[PDB]
Design an enzyme around this catalytic site. Structure first.
Site, PDB file in Angstrom:
ATOM      1  N   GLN A 133       0.705  -1.352   0.020  1.00 27.87           N
ATOM      2  CA  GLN A 133       0.074  -0.065  -0.045  1.00 27.87           C
ATOM      3  C   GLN A 133       0.885   1.372  -0.085  1.00 27.87           C
ATOM      4  O   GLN A 133       2.048   1.201   0.637  1.00 27.87           O
ATOM      5  CB  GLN A 133      -1.004  -0.100   1.154  1.00 27.87           C
ATOM      6  CG  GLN A 133      -1.989   1.246   1.063  1.00 27.87           C
ATOM      7  CD  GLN A 133      -2.905   1.150   2.366  1.00 27.87           C
ATOM      8  OE1 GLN A 133      -2.732   0.561   3.278  1.00 27.87           O
ATOM      9  NE2 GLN A 133      -4.179   1.777   2.138  1.00 27.87           N
ATOM     10  N   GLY A 256       1.975   0.476  11.991  1.00 31.31           N
ATOM     11  CA  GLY A 256       1.557   0.169  13.173  1.00 31.31           C
ATOM     12  C   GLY A 256       0.999  -1.244  12.906  1.00 31.31           C
ATOM     13  O   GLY A 256       0.875  -2.206  13.416  1.00 31.31           O
ATOM     14  N   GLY A 257       0.525  -1.337  11.537  1.00 32.20           N
ATOM     15  CA  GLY A 257      -0.136  -2.481  10.881  1.00 32.20           C
ATOM     16  C   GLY A 257      -0.812  -2.616   9.701  1.00 32.20           C
ATOM     17  O   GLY A 257      -1.457  -1.528   9.481  1.00 32.20           O
ATOM     18  N   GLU A 259      -3.692  -4.296   7.040  1.00 30.83           N
ATOM     19  CA  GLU A 259      -4.827  -4.933   6.959  1.00 30.83           C
ATOM     20  C   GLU A 259      -4.845  -6.333   5.864  1.00 30.83           C
ATOM     21  O   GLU A 259      -5.975  -6.347   4.989  1.00 30.83           O
ATOM     22  CB  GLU A 259      -6.085  -4.360   7.029  1.00 30.83           C
ATOM     23  CG  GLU A 259      -6.148  -3.618   5.543  1.00 30.83           C
ATOM     24  CD  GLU A 259      -5.719  -2.072   5.364  1.00 30.83           C
ATOM     25  OE1 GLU A 259      -4.617  -1.714   6.433  1.00 30.83           O
ATOM     26  OE2 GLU A 259      -6.221  -1.333   4.763  1.00 30.83           O
ATOM     27  N   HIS A 283      -8.627  -2.016  15.301  1.00 29.56           N
ATOM     28  CA  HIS A 283      -8.425  -1.393  14.061  1.00 29.56           C
ATOM     29  C   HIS A 283      -8.183  -1.934  12.788  1.00 29.56           C
ATOM     30  O   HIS A 283      -8.489  -1.703  11.661  1.00 29.56           O
ATOM     31  CB  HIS A 283      -7.510  -0.059  14.033  1.00 29.56           C
ATOM     32  CG  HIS A 283      -7.111   0.632  12.990  1.00 29.56           C
ATOM     33  ND1 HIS A 283      -8.315   1.444  12.380  1.00 29.56           N
ATOM     34  CD2 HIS A 283      -6.205   0.942  12.040  1.00 29.56           C
ATOM     35  CE1 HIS A 283      -7.745   2.154  11.254  1.00 29.56           C
ATOM     36  NE2 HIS A 283      -6.417   1.882  11.150  1.00 29.56           N
ATOM     37  N   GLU A 284      -7.377  -3.000  12.755  1.00 32.70           N
ATOM     38  CA  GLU A 284      -7.062  -3.636  11.597  1.00 32.70           C
ATOM     39  C   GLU A 284      -8.239  -4.770  11.358  1.00 32.70           C
ATOM     40  O   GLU A 284      -8.585  -5.156  10.276  1.00 32.70           O
ATOM     41  CB  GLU A 284      -5.935  -4.529  11.899  1.00 32.70           C
ATOM     42  CG  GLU A 284      -4.334  -3.653  12.074  1.00 32.70           C
ATOM     43  CD  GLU A 284      -4.087  -2.967  11.168  1.00 32.70           C
ATOM     44  OE1 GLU A 284      -5.020  -2.376  10.376  1.00 32.70           O
ATOM     45  OE2 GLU A 284      -2.953  -3.143  10.476  1.00 32.70           O
ATOM     46  N   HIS A 287     -10.825  -3.334   9.184  1.00 34.26           N
ATOM     47  CA  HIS A 287     -10.658  -3.171   7.658  1.00 34.26           C
ATOM     48  C   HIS A 287     -11.210  -4.179   7.118  1.00 34.26           C
ATOM     49  O   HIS A 287     -11.871  -3.903   6.027  1.00 34.26           O
ATOM     50  CB  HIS A 287      -9.076  -3.090   7.487  1.00 34.26           C
ATOM     51  CG  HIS A 287      -8.469  -1.859   7.452  1.00 34.26           C
ATOM     52  ND1 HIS A 287      -9.026  -0.673   6.831  1.00 34.26           N
ATOM     53  CD2 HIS A 287      -7.492  -1.427   8.106  1.00 34.26           C
ATOM     54  CE1 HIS A 287      -8.319   0.423   6.952  1.00 34.26           C
ATOM     55  NE2 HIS A 287      -7.045  -0.026   7.767  1.00 34.26           N
ATOM     56  N   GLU A 306     -10.279   4.382   5.817  1.00 32.28           N
ATOM     57  CA  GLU A 306      -9.641   4.929   7.089  1.00 32.28           C
ATOM     58  C   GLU A 306     -10.630   5.663   8.102  1.00 32.28           C
ATOM     59  O   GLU A 306     -10.911   5.195   9.065  1.00 32.28           O
ATOM     60  CB  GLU A 306      -8.505   5.790   7.083  1.00 32.28           C
ATOM     61  CG  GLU A 306      -7.633   5.357   6.146  1.00 32.28           C
ATOM     62  CD  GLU A 306      -7.271   3.917   6.502  1.00 32.28           C
ATOM     63  OE1 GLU A 306      -8.129   3.195   6.498  1.00 32.28           O
ATOM     64  OE2 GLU A 306      -6.027   3.584   7.007  1.00 32.28           O
ATOM     65  N   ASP A 361       1.662   7.948  -0.749  1.00 31.79           N
ATOM     66  CA  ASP A 361       2.288   7.899   0.617  1.00 31.79           C
ATOM     67  C   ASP A 361       2.820   9.281   1.376  1.00 31.79           C
ATOM     68  O   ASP A 361       2.476   9.419   2.491  1.00 31.79           O
ATOM     69  CB  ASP A 361       3.552   6.847   0.815  1.00 31.79           C
ATOM     70  CG  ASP A 361       3.238   5.581   0.313  1.00 31.79           C
ATOM     71  OD1 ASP A 361       2.068   4.774   0.894  1.00 31.79           O
ATOM     72  OD2 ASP A 361       3.905   4.731  -0.682  1.00 31.79           O
ATOM     73  N   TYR A 369      -9.025   9.453   8.782  1.00 31.29           N
ATOM     74  CA  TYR A 369      -9.544   8.473   9.911  1.00 31.29           C
ATOM     75  C   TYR A 369     -10.335   9.083  10.985  1.00 31.29           C
ATOM     76  O   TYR A 369     -11.471   8.633  11.287  1.00 31.29           O
ATOM     77  CB  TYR A 369      -8.164   8.179  10.649  1.00 31.29           C
ATOM     78  CG  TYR A 369      -7.023   7.248   9.924  1.00 31.29           C
ATOM     79  CD1 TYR A 369      -6.122   7.847   9.181  1.00 31.29           C
ATOM     80  CD2 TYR A 369      -7.039   5.808  10.173  1.00 31.29           C
ATOM     81  CE1 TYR A 369      -5.230   7.123   8.292  1.00 31.29           C
ATOM     82  CE2 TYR A 369      -6.147   5.112   9.579  1.00 31.29           C
ATOM     83  CZ  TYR A 369      -5.042   5.651   8.605  1.00 31.29           C
ATOM     84  OH  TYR A 369      -4.187   5.121   8.200  1.00 31.29           O
ATOM     85  N   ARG A 542       9.023   2.656  13.542  1.00 33.87           N
ATOM     86  CA  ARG A 542       7.415   2.736  13.152  1.00 33.87           C
ATOM     87  C   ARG A 542       7.522   4.412  12.901  1.00 33.87           C
ATOM     88  O   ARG A 542       8.177   5.041  13.554  1.00 33.87           O
ATOM     89  CB  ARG A 542       6.938   2.453  14.275  1.00 33.87           C
ATOM     90  CG  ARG A 542       5.321   2.623  14.387  1.00 33.87           C
ATOM     91  CD  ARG A 542       4.810   2.111  15.648  1.00 33.87           C
ATOM     92  NE  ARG A 542       3.151   2.465  15.472  1.00 33.87           N
ATOM     93  CZ  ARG A 542       2.108   2.141  16.439  1.00 33.87           C
ATOM     94  NH1 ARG A 542       2.538   1.508  17.689  1.00 33.87           N
ATOM     95  NH2 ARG A 542       1.175   2.389  16.342  1.00 33.87           N
ATOM     96  N   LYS A 544       4.900   6.925  12.777  1.00 31.10           N
ATOM     97  CA  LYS A 544       4.144   7.317  13.764  1.00 31.10           C
ATOM     98  C   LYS A 544       4.459   7.028  15.407  1.00 31.10           C
ATOM     99  O   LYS A 544       3.846   6.484  16.104  1.00 31.10           O
ATOM    100  CB  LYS A 544       2.573   7.026  13.738  1.00 31.10           C
ATOM    101  CG  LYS A 544       2.000   7.279  14.880  1.00 31.10           C
ATOM    102  CD  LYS A 544       0.837   6.392  15.299  1.00 31.10           C
ATOM    103  CE  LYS A 544       0.551   6.427  16.747  1.00 31.10           C
ATOM    104  NZ  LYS A 544      -0.558   5.902  17.215  1.00 31.10           N
TER     105      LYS A 544
HETATM  106 ZN   LIG Z   1      -5.090   1.308   8.467  1.00 28.56          ZN
END
Ligand SMILES: [Zn+2]
Length: 587
Positions: A133, A256-257, A259, A283-284, A287, A306, A361, A369, A542, A544
């Site tokens: 992504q 953080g992850g 999906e 959160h994941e 998705h 999001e 990106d 979100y 990471r 964030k």
């Molecule tokens: Zn996400």
């Protein structure tokens, strides 16, 4: 064709499946074999199969003619774009029902992270994982990289003996795995991980894969996820993917992850020990419905993803943990939205964002979100859950395994809500919500009591300049600690030390805590937490959790220099997706 970023003429041709025959070579850092697209043509007259690619090496291309004969066709590999890569135009038989591309990816592939055995926890074997992504699938798969195009995939992956392959499909060791995803998904969701993985489940349809060190710690930490899925199904419809696993990636993971259907890639930074950063997994799992089941057709509709996923994320948090944990998280989050709207360009704060020809990106914030959440929270409060949630459930059922654009979401949001139950919300509040910068003022502004008892407390005047520190800290949750550190005044400077020496937020275990602490420290010039911040910046990658740190750091030329000195140590090891970002905020 609402979608730059794809050379794919998804106008006349659309791939319905992808068979991958790949070999994982860790010495050349490349996957090599072949991609076999199966196509569906719409135009009766001849047209080329245009595919997206990046730093892909092409060997040969075949297609199946009107007689199922694999004949060799010729291709043009266009000049490489800086953002879209090289367009592959293959000259295919009128209505070629299949095409086989033989290629390899190169180690410069932007959608793949090749980690040396040393950049791993086992220290014994290397590790590979994808992140496709927004538009990185083309860096190791010649395809129509578009969220508008969904395909099922089967894949024969070859690896070493003593390495395991994982993907976003069904896994039925030896070094010969073959995966199958009978569920049509957009490419950014095709994912692969290869490494020294071990597996323990938790429930009947949830488990974890990891490097042993973090294995059992991780199973102890997300053993609630089954609960997420049962409470989530109660309100949102069935979890149409069957199994839901967690793949803990090494400390290098930039996000953080991700999906990835059936296999969410999770950062180790969330295995805290107290279940506090767990909304990440809720959160994941969200998705599965927003951004997986129903996906944005372009990257300007990224908020339909999001937004809803953030909204549903919270709901699942309320259902399994309670609304006080839930709104304690909406507030904590809405405070950052406000902080970002401020540092953000009054054009990016729009929901149906214009990309301006940027990198999907680069053009990325918290906006879609939280603002997309407050937006849906607005419709909630306006209509009620009964009515809102029935609608949202139909919304997901009705777009099952489909693509959707902002304009059409609206048509549906009106025909099934705003117009179904007329005179509650006006198309002005709708248009205002999705198209205009900053927040509508009438935008929900979640408020948490516990937080706000704290607000009153943070008032120990100049410092111990009313009240000692005999506050309820020994009762403060992770959420209640980020609020303290968060709206604590930036004029403590050294004044700051009672704080660190009492609670020791410097060597704080939970990473979020360590973050908000260094953020505040450097701001007020609490110059004391620079060494601990150094290892922190060098250790985790990471974004964030280091990006905003490098930002504030790099805004006082004397301080901005301390950054470059450390970013020269932490640079190698970071994921490209991170280096990229920090490479810009560090002039
Ligand atoms: Zn996400």
């Amino acid at each position: 064709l609402t979608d730059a970023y794809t050379y794919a003429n998804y106008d006349q041709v659309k791939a319905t499946h992808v068979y991958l025959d790949l070999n994982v070579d860790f010495d050349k850092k490349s996957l090599s074999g072949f991609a076999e697209l199966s196509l569906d043509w719409f135009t009766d007259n001849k047209a080329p199969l245009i595919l997206d690619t990046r730093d892909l090496v092409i060997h040969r291309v075949m297609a199946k003619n009107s007689q199922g004969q694999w004949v060799k066709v010729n291709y043009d590999l266009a000049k490489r774009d800086d953002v879209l890569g090289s367009k592959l135009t293959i000259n295919t038989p009128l209505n070629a029902k299949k095409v086989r591309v033989y290629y390899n990816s190169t180690e410069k592939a932007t959608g793949l992270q090749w980690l040396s055995a040393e950049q791993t926890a086992g220290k014994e074997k290397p590790f590979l994982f994808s992140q496709n992504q927004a538009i990185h699938a083309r860096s190791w798969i010649p395809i129509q990289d578009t969220p508008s195009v969904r395909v099922t995939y089967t894949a024969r992956i070859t690896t070493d003996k003593d390495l395991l392959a994982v993907m976003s499909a069904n896994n039925e060791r030896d070094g010969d795995y073959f995966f199958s995803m009978p569920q049509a998904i957009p490419p950014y969701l095709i994912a692969i991980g290869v490494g020294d993985l071990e597996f323990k489940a938790m429930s009947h349809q949830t488990g974890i894969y990891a490097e042993s060190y973090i294995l059992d710690a991780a199973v102890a930490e997300f053993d609630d996820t089954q609960a997420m899925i049962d409470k989530a199904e109660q309100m949102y419809g069935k979890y149409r993917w069957g199994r839901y696993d967690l793949l803990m990636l090494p400390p290098s993971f930039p996000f953080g992850g991700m999906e990835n259907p059936r296999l969410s890639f999770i950062t180790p930074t969330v295995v805290a020990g107290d279940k506090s950063l767990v909304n990440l997994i809720a959160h994941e799992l969200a998705h599965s419905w927003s951004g997986n089941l129903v996906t944005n057709e372009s990257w300007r509709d990224l908020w339909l993803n999001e937004g809803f996923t953030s909204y549903v994320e919270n709901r699942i948090m309320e259902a399994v943990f309670g609304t006080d944990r839930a709104v304690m998280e909406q507030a904590l989050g809405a405070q950052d939205l406000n902080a970002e709207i401020l540092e953000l360009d009054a054009s990016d704060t729009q929901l149906y964002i214009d990309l301006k020809g940027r990198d999907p990106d680069d053009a990325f914030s918290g906006v879609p979100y939280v603002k997309g959440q407050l937006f849906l929270m607005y419709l909630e409060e306006k209509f009620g859950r009964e009515r809102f949630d029935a609608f949202v459930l139909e919304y997901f059922d009705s777009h099952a395994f489909q693509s959707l654009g902002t304009d059409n979401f609206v048509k549906y949001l009106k025909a099934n809500l705003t117009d179904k139950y007329p005179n509650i919300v006006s198309d002005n509040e709708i248009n205002e919500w999705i198209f205009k910068a900053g927040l509508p003022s009438y935008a929900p502004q979640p408020t948490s009591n516990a937080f706000k008892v704290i607000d009153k407390q943070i008032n120990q005047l100049v410092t111990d300049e009313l009240t000692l520190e005999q506050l309820p800290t020994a009762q403060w949750t992770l959420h209640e600690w980020l609020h303290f550190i968060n709206n604590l005044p930036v004029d403590l400077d050294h004044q700051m030390v009672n704080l660190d020496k009492a609670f020791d937020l410097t060597n704080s275990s939970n990473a979020e805590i360590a973050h908000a602490w260094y953020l505040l420290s450097v701001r007020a010039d609490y110059k004391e937490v620079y060494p601990a911040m150094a290892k922190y910046l060098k250790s985790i990658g990471r974004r964030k959790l280091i990006v905003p740190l490098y930002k504030e750091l790099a805004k006082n030329a004397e301080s901005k220099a301390w950054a470059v000195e450390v970013y020269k140590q932490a640079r190698p090891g970071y994921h490209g997706l991170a280096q990229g970002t920090v490479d810009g905020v560090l002039k």
